[PDB]
């Protein structure tokens, strides 16, 4: 949900979020000593913005109501503006890289996950055993059968 | 109701700067922008400048180029306006200017004007 | 070059007139931004016409006014006692926005 200039204008984040948000601070890979002038975003939209919308647009916004025929004056206003990122421009205003995931399911297979066991065996032991899927109990050891590859 | 406001009177001496701030109260100053203009003793009008609260376009006139800067800060909701170098004919009076912008329309017009601050420089 | 000289220099009339005022441009400029100011003396002006054929927002005696690419002009057909003031031009179509020369109205005794 939430509000204000981000997450509202330019990227929308959905209720019922199925993800993960991670934002790890960074002040020597970015904000480039002077200045560092690269990213832009948006300012001004004529409407709010639906759950998982990318408006990349360069077209002229217009504020009243007179068309303007690409001409940078009133009632008409170009939206994208540049991030004012400075060396020291505070540490609320420092430039935050974000990554946020999105996990998802439906009528499909399964295909990212990370099981973990190794554990070592053991032989010559009544020991409950757990391959995978399958499990049991029973004293594990060495034979001679062939298996097809 | 929806007006605004600008701060009062100033006297100051020819070598300083001025800083009147334009109050905007009663619509949505943040889609909108202010015009800065400056009235002499019973003469003809004259143009400043003139902001985009919006942030990021700022004009200014081919005289008015230098010695002036207008600051205008979001989180007062406010607009201000700095001219350096104070000189002798800069005794005036200044105004105040913004459109009523409501939300989905921005009014085609600057319907509402500060009361206008006053400077006079001498000895 | 950009001006907004005013062809009436002032008036003096009854109370009641065509009360024709005249702004001719120079550049040609679309009659789309530009606004007519009224200023009595002592006080800040107040918006009265914009768009060149618009109205305000409340406007008494139903003042009128339309003009052309470089003609413009604002009629007040049976000026009241009441208005008497100073009238300035403005366009903000392009930079610089140069202002209006000035007009003055006042009654014949």
């Known amino acids: 949900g939430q509000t204000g200039k981000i997450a509202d204008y330019n990227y929308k984040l959905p209720d019922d979020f199925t993800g993960c948000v991670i934002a790890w601070n960074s002040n020597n890979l970015d904000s480039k000593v002077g200045g560092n002038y690269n990213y832009l975003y948006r300012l001004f939209r004529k409407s709010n913005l639906k759950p998982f919308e990318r408006d990349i647009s360069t077209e002229i916004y217009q504020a009243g109501s007179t068309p303007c025929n690409g001409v940078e004056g009133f009632n008409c206003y170009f939206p994208l503006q540049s991030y004012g990122f400075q060396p020291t421009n505070g540490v609320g205003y420092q430039p935050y890289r974000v990554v946020v995931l999105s996990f998802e399911l439906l009528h499909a297979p399964a295909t990212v996950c990370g099981p973990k066991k190794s554990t070592n065996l053991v032989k010559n032991k009544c020991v409950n055993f757990n391959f995978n899927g399958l499990t049991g109990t029973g004293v594990l050891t060495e034979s001679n059968k062939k298996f097809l590859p | 109701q929806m007006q605004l406001v600008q701060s009062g009177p100033e006297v100051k001496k020819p070598g300083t700067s001025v800083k009147v701030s334009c109050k905007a109260s009663?619509?949505?100053?943040?889609?909108?922008?202010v015009q800065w203009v400056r009235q002499a003793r019973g003469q003809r009008l004259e143009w400043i400048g003139w902001?985009?609260?919006?942030?990021?376009?700022?004009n200014y006139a081919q005289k008015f180029q230098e010695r002036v800067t207008i600051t205008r800060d979001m989180s007062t909701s406010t607009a201000y306006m700095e001219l350096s170098s104070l000189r002798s004919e800069d005794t005036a009076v200044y105004y105040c200017?913004?459109?009523?912008?409501?939300?989905?329309?921005?009014?085609?017009?600057?319907?509402?004007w500060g009361q206008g601050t006053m400077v006079t420089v001498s000895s | 070059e950009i001006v907004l000289t005013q062809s009436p220099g002032t008036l003096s009339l009854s109370p009641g007139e065509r009360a024709t005022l005249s702004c001719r441009a120079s550049?040609?400029?679309?009659?789309?931004?530009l606004a007519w100011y009224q200023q009595k003396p002592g006080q800040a002006p107040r918006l009265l016409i914009y768009?060149?054929?618009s109205r305000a927002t409340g406007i008494p005696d139903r003042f009128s006014g339309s003009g052309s690419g470089t003609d413009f002009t604002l009629t007040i057909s049976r000026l009241e006692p009441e208005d008497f003031a100073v009238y300035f031009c403005?366009?903000?179509?392009?930079?610089?926005?140069?202002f209006g020369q000035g007009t003055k109205v006042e009654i014949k005794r």
């Open positions: 200017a913004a459109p009523n912008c409501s939300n989905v329309v921005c009014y085609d017009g600057f319907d509402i």
């Open positions: 009663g619509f949505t100053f943040t889609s909108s922008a």
């Open positions: 902001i985009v609260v919006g942030s990021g376009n700022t």
């Open positions: 550049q040609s400029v679309s009659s789309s931004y």
């Open positions: 768009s060149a054929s």
């Open positions: 403005q366009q903000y179509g392009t930079s610089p926005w140069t």
